[PDB]
Amino acid sequence: AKKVSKRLEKLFSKIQNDK
């Protein structure tokens, strides 16, 4: 399963909301 992306997306979520 290469959907670990979710966990990665979780860590990047912080940078995403850099408004």
UniProtKB/Swiss-Prot annotation:
Origin superkingdom: Bacteria
Complexes and interactors: Part of the 50S ribosomal subunit.
Reported function: Binds directly to 23S rRNA. The L1 stalk is quite mobile in the ribosome, and is involved in E site tRNA release.
Family in the record: Belongs to the universal ribosomal protein uL1 family.
Name recorded for this polypeptide: Large ribosomal subunit protein uL1
Originating organism: Helicobacter pylori (strain J99 / ATCC 700824) (Campylobacter pylori J99)
